[PDB]
Design a protein around this nucleic acid. Structure first.
Lengths: 333, 301, 51
RNA sequence: CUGAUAACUUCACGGCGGGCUUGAUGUCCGCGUCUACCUGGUGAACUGCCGAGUAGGUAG
């Protein structure tokens, strides 16, 4: 069990999202930003308190009303621009069929046989819709879909005989899961993700394009660097610096599918221990036995059962097959 | 109380302001200034022969006050969720929504550019909306008190649609705002100023290729938020902060020796569930508590 | 997980849910490029006929 | 009030000859940094005149 060397690699391969400004002349230009210094008040609680006590004659009414300088990076839409566009690419492959490094051919035959049986008994129709209902919905813009007039998505699949698949205004049209199903090209896209999870050289590639309608001089919020001041990540598009929203963050929106944890309310980022980032309580803890390492050690158990209850058996096969699509490092001594 | 990681996100989203110069022949150009010289001093004025001056920004009323952004604890979670949900019933969003809207309506966001003006008019453009452009004409001599607004044809719908934007989860309300200022000939315009930690350097942007001043996006967020007159013996409305800081004089009201700052009311959250399950001061400090959750900020020690 | 089981009870609920900062190199094809062009050289000779 | 008192170590000098470190090599697998911000010119250096003049001059 967990034979001290075992690793997979990822099946989903996104990129980073470069923003563009379109004008009413239809000509495109890259969005930019500048650094701005500002002045705020003295908000922090430790400046005028401590554990049960105000500081000793240092919290004076003249010194809590001083000027505090900060500095931010500030980005917004220029005046007169028509709308905003976004553009990345994502590709799905077949990497979960077989481990990358394995070290033991007795846990290898347990895992390869477990993926052949999953394709047959309870197939790829549940996982393929959930990754695709975050690409064709706009989870990957993350906060720019609040305070918007309208946004659209048009994607260019490969290989494909036909047209581009469009999705018009997503706040009333494409809301439920049944709304996506009535589209003209929905059964042909999910018969292209099921293939790529089932071949041995399976490959489906999508070129995803979006528009955004925001108010006048409205703000755009990309991702930030870590600083081992609100510094933005940026690349160089045609000589101009420009914010990018990152590539490890657009792959975390697509993998926001997990709602099988034992009392669900919203989808989480798929992980080994089930962390949740707003409130720092970690659901799917290793005490309850519902995390990844516990239910992987019943791999021989779940083979024989489906050779079926959608209460604990099928809900654990979805979590176990989704961590193998994420990839990683599954071992200890 | 205050378990070391708590933060809210703001619920009012103003943008920069832009100054355009309209000619008599219905042509609009950007208002450009002059620089004079390390030591650098700027000068801005209305160009001769111009009719008036236009201004346009936008603001949004969203619903990020229902739950926090990071919370760290499920005892400060369901307490602060219940306070905003009980304030919706017993008090209502009426007394806050009217105060935020009037500072948008009566040109308060034009700081010192209304002094020595003949007439100015302000036109809203709400969304989602079935109807007409909303007008407020000759504001100095027609709209001066809470009651002149309440006689308007379109005040029952714009106090509304903000009340729903705080009450309903995933709510939204967006206002486009336009103003026209009839200033005298060769009149001075007063934009915002760059900090320059130690003069009068303007905050500029590029509109149609040539530079133009902005009057800031944090500057126009301060003007809408001046609704605070519940500090004791209040004579003038202040900007909503944690310690009631006044800017012109460098004192501050609301000091923790008084017992009326935010951190000595936020700790008393369980006390106020009992009375709301009282119209003297238990109401008049929840207007300060609600205006801090609409503001945002990290609340942690 | 300590050795084989019985998890080490210092990694509590919120202890697992912090970050883990790292640093990697990153290479990508820039926006608006056409294609990526590779080149090397290889040579064959007779070095096996005698030691 | 000194193991006390006094004290010239000097002249001359060729290290040299010769020299192949070599053969072979896959560092890899996974990754959300984020929340909140006022810089404060009161009225203040005003009005003519010549010249075609966004140049130039000239008044109290």
């Amino acid at each position: 069990k967990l034979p001290t060397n075992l690793a997979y690699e990822r099946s989903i391969d996104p990129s980073d999202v470069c923003f563009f400004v379109v004008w009413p002349d239809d000509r495109k230009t890259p969005l930019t930003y500048n650094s701005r210094t500002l002045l705020g008040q003295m908000e922090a609680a430790s400046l005028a308190y401590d554990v049960s006590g105000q500081p000793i004659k240092s919290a004076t009414a003249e010194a809590l009303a001083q000027g505090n300088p900060h500095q931010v990076d500030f980005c917004h839409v220029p005046y007169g621009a028509s709308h905003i566009e976004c553009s990345f690419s994502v590709s799905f492959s077949s990497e979960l069929r077989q481990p990358y490094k394995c070290n033991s051919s007795k846990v290898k035959q347990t895992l390869v046989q477990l993926v052949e049986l999953y394709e047959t008994k309870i197939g790829w129709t549940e996982l393929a819709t959930r990754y695709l209902m975050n690409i064709c919905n706009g989870k990957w813009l993350w906060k720019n879909t609040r305070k918007a007039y309208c946004w659209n998505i048009v994607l260019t699949p490969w290989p494909w005989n036909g047209e581009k698949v469009g999705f018009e205004d997503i706040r009333t049209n494409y809301t439920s899961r049944q709304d996506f199903k009535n589209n003209k090209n929905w059964s042909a896209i999910v018969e292209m993700i099921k293939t790529a999870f089932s071949s041995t050289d399976g490959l489906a590639i999508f070129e995803v394009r979006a528009t955004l309608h925001l108010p006048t001089n409205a703000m755009v919020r990309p991702s930030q660097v870590f600083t081992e001041s609100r510094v933005f990540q940026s690349t160089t598009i045609d000589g101009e610096r420009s914010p990018i929203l990152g590539a490890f963050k657009t792959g975390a929106a697509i993998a926001t599918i997990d709602d099988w944890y034992p009392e669900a309310t919203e989808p989480l980022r798929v992980g080994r221990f089930g962390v949740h980032r707003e409130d720092v309580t970690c659901y799917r803890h290793p005490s309850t036995g519902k995390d990844f390492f516990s239910i992987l050690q019943q791999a021989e158990h779940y083979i024989e059962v489906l050779s079926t209850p959608a209460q604990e058996t099928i809900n654990d096969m979805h979590f176990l097959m989704a961590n193998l699509i994420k990839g990683g490092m599954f071992q200890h001594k």
